[PDB]
Design a protein that fits this description.
monomer, about 140 residues, alpha+beta, ATP Synthase, domain 1, Helix Hairpins, 5-stranded mixed beta sheet, ATP_synth_F1_esu_C
Length: about 140
């Protein structure tokens, strides 16, 4: 009758609440899974997601992780979870700076594993960090 989404981390379990439709940015750009959906596995990157139980909606910031839906069972194995209470101004300035130096350093003779992943990770983290409700107006 309805879908059941649940988040999980490599350090422990987050929770498992119901849902009628989950919409969030995915590889292709758009990802819309429902209860009637079939059992399939997918991948997702850092960023916040929106959940619709019926008439209301909730926002949860989830970093890079894997998602898999099946029989109203969505397993989100993310490395980091946030209930929107992770907004930190100092975090945004630290993320942008840490990334700017991280990238420049990577090419200067440092850990240059993934330039796009490193820049997208920090950028996304900071973007969602404040977007969670840290800054609305100056």
């Amino acid at each position: 009758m309805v879908m059941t989404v649940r988040v999980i981390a490599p350090d422990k379990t987050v929770w498992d609440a119901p849902a009628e439709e989950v919409i969030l940015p995915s590889t292709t750009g758009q990802l819309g899974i429902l209860s009637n959906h079939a059992p399939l596995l997918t991948a997702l990157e850092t960023g916040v997601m929106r959940v619709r139980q019926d008439r209301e909606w909730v926002a949860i910031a989830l970093m890079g992780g894997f998602a898999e839906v099946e029989n109203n069972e969505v397993t989100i194995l993310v490395n980091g979870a946030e209930r929107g209470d992770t907004i930190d101004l100092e975090k945004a300035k630290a993320e942008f700076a840490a990334a700017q130096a991280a990238l420049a350093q990577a090419e200067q003779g440092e850990s240059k594993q993934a330039k796009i992943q490193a820049t997208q990770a920090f950028r996304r983290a900071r973007a969602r960090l404040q977007a969670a409700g840290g800054v609305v107006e100056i």
